[PDB]
Design a protein around this ligand. Structure first.
Ligand SMILES: O=C(O)C[C@@H](SC/C=N/O)C(=O)O
Ligand SMILES: O=C(O)C[C@@H](SC/C=N\O)C(=O)O
Ligand SMILES: [Fe+3]
Ligand SMILES: [Fe+3]
Lengths: 325, 325
């Protein structure tokens, strides 16, 4: 299977890929697993210090560890990913406020950060919204839309698991329920996107494996953020996504209709326009309750800044692919 | 913080509790974590061979590891819990099937197992249904009902996390949505039970920590099964609970109304009578697809039998406590 860990690892011409493979064996010893964790940590350190090959190598290995679908190795894979996450977060630039911002000041900082970094301001977004994109160019856009959308519900579920307050788990459960099609699994949002992809000649593969480095970096970061033990990381990515999807999707919907798509064909984008603003308003209380905590504020803001960095490098790479077709 | 891991460990007169504490430290080394794992596995092995003190020790530590609420230590706690689970599973009388049973023989064996040991036939259940229980004795019953209900949704979420198929994750999402109150979190099933609990004088403590050995055994086993990498373990526990809840809760509902509180206060039991039956028919498909796989059948039936042994010993202990008042 294409999105299992071991087939992906055999395809990486890296020695650490074989050490990781040994660490994921059914009878792997603690020493093999600690060896994998140390060599992964050193690879990530070398890559984050400026070694372009170690940088690419650890990002590919981290993609395999964090996002493969062979559930038998999942617990050890998540253990190994943590060895890499620890290194990454030491290199990330951390927000270090010592005193908590006011709730009003905090929301305004978010609004400002969004206005400065929103995916909606990217030249590619504006260009498609303009109607000037070719059909093959929309296909580039939707090919990568598939990778962003199709397993988002799993990252949300990792955050659900880490919210110990029953009311906060419930808010995330309502999100997951909406995201998985409510009472009809034929209408889960991954399948709505699949219906749109098929309307424009693309396959929606639930075992899709990305080969674009910036997309891998985006998916790796998002999973790390939603899985973090300090939920400020995950609430940052979750909530910024909830705030940006409605207007972005309203313009993407219009662009697809302009591009020769039906209302039903473009339903994936249509349903978020109306489903999200109410839910986003109720989900805000998860952030409001934690604002007095300066550790939460620093985790949230560091998460947000890191998310924006990888999202921008990713949109830039999609934009380049779109221009070459 | 009464149900966080470190405060619980400092209150355990078990030597290995200190080693576990060291393993959960912010900067714990691989040696300290691996050491803790080794001592926990040895303690479990001694306990399952008959050392009652080692048995009690491994069960209290496993309770702290698997069910404490400080998410900062959860990943390492779940890692250490695995070392105990592997030992436990070597001692479980597993259905040794060499080849897969037919669907016909699988459902028949399932029906037979449920017929022989369902919780509904336990003398305490028929006694409660009988009307004859005193208020103090119903308090005993509901005090332990709290421990079974108040974090069940978390165990189901771990199973959701391990269901890689999007339509099957959707099925578990429909379950969680219902269990956490659909659009209204004040109606989540833990809070409905908490309201039933407020009537009669009992506290519903979201940080409750059990000190009843058979109850610890029940919660430990259930979390292990729902977290297992082979989803047969969790599907076994999940499905046996969904199938028995409607009849059991129907009879408990009528008995509680006959004990003098309204239908609405006892809403926790009524809602299951109608809510669960339609969802159980769709949830069966997750099991039907896997019947042909003998590895699934062996996990499922081993889990069912282990769940019934632990459920029966727990119900026995509640019944003894109930008869002491
Ligand atoms: O990549 C991301 O995280 C943003 C997704 S949001 C789709 C679903 N929203 O509920 C996108 O590309 O639109
Ligand atoms: O874990 C158990 O023993 C089963 C629970 S069912 C609660 C289900 N939804 O609220 C019980 O004891 O009634
Ligand atoms: Fe969505
Ligand atoms: Fe329920």
């Amino acid at each position: 299977t294409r999105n299992f860990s071991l087939p992906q690892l055999q395809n990486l011409p890296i020695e650490e890929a074989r050490i990781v493979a040994d660490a994921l064996a059914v009878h792997a010893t603690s020493r093999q697993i600690d060896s994998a964790a140390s060599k992964l940590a050193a690879l990530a350190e070398a890559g984050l210090k400026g070694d372009r090959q170690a940088y690419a190598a650890y990002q590919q290995l981290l993609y395999v560890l964090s996002l493969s679908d062979d559930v038998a190795t999942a617990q050890t894979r998540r253990w190994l990913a943590r060895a890499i996450y620890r290194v990454e977060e030491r290199f990330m630039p951390a927000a270090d406020l010592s005193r908590a911002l006011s709730e009003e000041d905090f929301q305004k900082r978010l609004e400002q950060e969004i206005a400065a970094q929103s995916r909606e301001r990217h030249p590619m977004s504006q260009y498609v919204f303009s109607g000037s994109a070719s059909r093959a160019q929309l296909q580039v856009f939707l090919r990568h839309q598939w990778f962003r959308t199709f397993r988002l519900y799993r990252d949300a579920a990792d955050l659900l698991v880490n919210l110990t307050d029953v009311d906060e788990a419930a808010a995330l459960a309502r999100y997951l329920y909406g995201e998985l099609g409510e009472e009809d699994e034929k209408g889960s949002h991954p399948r709505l996107l699949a219906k749109l992809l098929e309307a424009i000649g693309l396959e929606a593969d639930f075992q899709a494996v990305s080969t674009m480095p910036e997309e891998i970096a985006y998916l790796n970061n998002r999973a790390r953020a939603f899985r973090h033990a300090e939920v400020g990381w995950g609430l940052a990515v979750f909530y910024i996504t909830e705030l940006v999807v409605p207007g972005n999707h309203e313009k993407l919907y219009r662009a697809l209709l302009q591009a020769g798509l039906s209302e039903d064909q473009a339903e994936y984008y249509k349903v978020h326009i109306s489903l999200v603003p109410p839910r986003a308003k109720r989900e805000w209380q998860l952030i409001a309750r934690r604002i007095p905590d300066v550790q939460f504020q620093n985790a949230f803001l560091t998460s947000l800044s890191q998310h924006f960095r990888v999202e921008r490098a990713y949109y830039d790479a999609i934009w380049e692919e779109m221009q070459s077709v």
